[PDB]
Design a protein around this ligand. Structure first.
Ligand code: ATP
Ligand code: MN
Length: 429
């Protein structure tokens, strides 16, 4: 149709308008009719699976871990394939759903895609109700939403918030961190509620439980802003988030809790008011928003990824321009030689290390299986487990205090992350 190359379109209908399950299949059917080599990009594998069914019997290859011109994969999968030697089709049409996702792989993907549009080699469609720079925390909905500013608990409580537990419906509660969510969920559970906790690490297995089991509360991080569907009538929003910040170019901290963006607030609010024959959904929020970023590490990490993706001779892809000033970096300053790039990739995939940390280790000429850097840092880089120095048994047979040469707070911000990094340090993966 007008997928006739040459162009980037931002489909920005209000939340719940039918972008993912009404408009998306229409575009795919058009793309197949016009025989365009197309890729579909979902934010998560959970959402990718729900797209399988909305794309009823259409020739779509699902690269989710014949005459097949149309691919479906998640944001991170797409970006991950671009970094590897493994061949990626120069698609004629790029479709990114939930294109507001601010994770490094999603930022990198938007940059790569938009760059391909500018070069005149492809068309692109970014689907999101909240494009970069939106200041509207209260967009349109299918049904009226009762918006109420309240004092939202960020700690366990024994009194003062009756309205929280005095609610017979189902509530989605956005928290700024996993650990904060743990405390709130434990309080709700003790008060007799059934609670499901969602985070980025647990999402792909815990989200499916929000359907096939009963629940009163979902306590979730900002991961549920990316196309997550709940049968709920209430959203409690702390309006808080944590921001990864690179300090003095030498370490990453998790600053906050801190005001979420208008986009995030709109996406959080947008979890309800979706049912057209159902008014009464409430959005209860505990504070204001802010354009917080620009020292947000994710956009620098996105640059690290994009610098190591090849398009054609000497060419480095630009960030999607509405996002391009979110970071102070020179394009190509993180480009690694091919051997270092390989280590960089493995550290992110098999190593499951944050992009920033993986770059530090790889650019220092360290091989993937060399874990000495996990112990030879300054003593202020010491990682604590419950107010006591965390220790692992090394591959060489010593009990060493975990003390990484480069400190990234994301490797120990909760128990699951610490367990994973402790295992990485012991050379177990
Ligand atoms: N298979 C389906 N087809 C069409 N509509 C559906 C389907 N399943 C659920 N719906 C409902 O129809 C509405 C359309 O939802 P959809 O996810 O397409 O909106 P959206 O524009 O993607 O929202 P957002 O921008 O917040 O992701 C929702 O309120 C949803 O609850
Ligand atoms: Mn959607």
């Amino acid at each position: 149709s007008m997928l006739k190359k040459k162009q980037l379109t931002v489909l920005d209908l209000h939340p719940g308008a039918g972008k993912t399950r009404r408009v998306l299949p229409e575009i795919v059917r058009e793309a197949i009719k016009t025989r365009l080599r197309t890729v579909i990009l979902a934010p998560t594998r959970v959402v990718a699976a729900e797209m399988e069914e909305a794309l009823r019997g259409l020739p779509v290859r699902y690269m989710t871990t014949g005459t097949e011109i149309v691919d479906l994969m998640c944001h991170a999968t797409f970006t991950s394939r671009l970094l590897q030697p493994i061949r990626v089709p120069n698609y004629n049409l790029y479709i990114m759903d939930e294109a507001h996702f601010t994770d490094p792989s999603s930022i990198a993907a938007r940059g790569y895609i938009s760059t391909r549009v500018e070069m005149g080699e492809a068309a692109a469609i970014f689907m999101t109700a909240t494009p970069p720079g939106t200041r509207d925390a209260f967009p349109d909905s299918n049904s009226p939403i009762m918006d109420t500013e309240v004092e939202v608990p960020e700690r366990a409580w024994s009194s003062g918030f009756d309205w929280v537990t005095d609610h017979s419906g189902k509530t989605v509660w956005f928290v700024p961190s996993v650990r904060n969510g743990n405390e709130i969920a434990a309080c709700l559970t003790k008060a007799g509620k059934r609670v499901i906790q969602l985070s980025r690490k647990t999402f792909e297995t815990e989200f499916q439980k929000t359907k096939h089991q009963e629940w009163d509360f979902v306590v979730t991080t900002d991961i549920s802003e990316m196309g997550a569907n709940f049968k709920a009538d209430r959203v409690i929003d702390s309006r808080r988030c944590l921001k990864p910040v690179i300090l003095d170019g030498e370490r990453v901290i998790l600053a906050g809790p801190m005001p979420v963006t208008h986009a995030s607030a709109a996406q959080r609010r947008g979890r309800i008011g979706r049912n057209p024959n159902k008014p009464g959904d409430e959005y209860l929020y505990g504070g204001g928003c802010a354009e917080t970023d620009e020292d947000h590490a994710h956009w620098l990490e996105a640059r690290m990824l994009l610098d190591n993706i090849y398009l054609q001779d000497g060419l480095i892809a630009s960030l999607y321009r509405p996002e391009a000033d979110k970071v102070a970096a020179i394009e190509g300053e993180f480009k690694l030689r091919t051997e270092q790039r390989k280590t960089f990739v493995e550290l992110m995939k098999r190593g499951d290390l944050p992009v920033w940390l993986a770059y530090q280790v790889a650019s220092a000429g360290i091989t993937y299986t060399d874990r000495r850097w996990c112990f030879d840092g300054t003593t202020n880089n010491t990682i604590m487990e419950d107010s006591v120095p965390a220790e692992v048994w090394t591959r060489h047979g010593e009990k060493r205090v975990l003390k990484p040469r480069w400190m990234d707070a994301r490797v120990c911000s909760d128990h699951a992350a610490l367990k994973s990094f402790k295992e990485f340090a012991a050379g177990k993966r």
